[PDB]
Amino acid sequence: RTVTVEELPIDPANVAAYAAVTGLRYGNQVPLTYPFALTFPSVMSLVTGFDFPFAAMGAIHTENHITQYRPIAVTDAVGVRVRAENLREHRRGLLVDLVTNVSVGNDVAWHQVTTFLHQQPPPAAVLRITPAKIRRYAAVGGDHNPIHTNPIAAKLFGFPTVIAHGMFTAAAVLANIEARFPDAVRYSVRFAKPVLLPATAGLYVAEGDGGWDLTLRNMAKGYPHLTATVRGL
């Protein structure tokens, strides 16, 4: 239950296209969330190879914790390690933790815990999220889970329309604030109601220190799509 890549190259053109579609800045270091996408093929090879029943197609992303110890340069080639751990019963199904460590040289730069489920007032910003943009996020980020792109498959897996990738939303909400993030930062997200597409969602931001609290809501109905914290280390 362990995957390794010794020297994964970074494609800057992909980093640019990731920043464009999520609304983040393309600079010399990759966005804080970008290594989710970079290591995604490595995570899915672990998930798809689970001995027991657990399907990547139609899987649900419930929670995500990123710890960045140091930025990763767009020119870096990276070491990747993934392990899967903490199978639990939930209610809606099987939960599992996928734990990824991304290294530059001998050092761990970026550390993530991803939790998946197999089913068994005026805002500080506004996000417009269309099916087209998410079709584009799926191409660029490489998560082709069809609940985000194929309506017929979304229905089959329980949703009335296609939904946004949780990690699209988790990237997009950092747009304004990311320029003030320190190099060492932790970002914790709890996904709630899926974002049904197309949608216009409002982001609420408080400065609960030394950092930020975030809540993304559906604008008509007001229910939460996610809550998150950003903190310096």
- Asked if residue 189 binds Mg ion (CB under 5 A), the reply is yes
Q: Which of 34, 116, 187, 191 binds Mg ion (CB under 5 A)?
A: 187
> How far is it, in rounded angstroms, from Cα 4 to Cα 6?
6
Q: Quick one: 154 or 166, whose CB is closer to Mg ion?
A: 166
Q: Quick one: 35 or 202, whose CB is closer to Mg ion?
A: 35
List the strands of the sheet with 125-129, edge to edge: 2-9, 77-89, 93-104, 107-119, 60-68, 185-191, 224-232, 211-218, 199-206, 125-129
Nearest-approach distance from CB 63 to Mg ion, in angstroms: 8
Nearest-approach distance from CB 171 to Mg ion, in angstroms: 9
Q: Quick one: 15 or 226, whose CB is closer to Mg ion?
A: 226
- Residues 51-80 binding Mg ion (CB under 5 A) are 64, 66
> How far is it, in rounded angstroms, from Cα 30 to Cα 24?
10
- Which of these segments, 15-23, 116-124, 172-180, 183-191, binds Mg ion (CB under 5 A)? 183-191
> How far is it, in rounded angstroms, from Cα 29 to Cα 151?
35
The residue ranges that bind Mg ion (CB under 5 A) are 64, 66, 187, 189
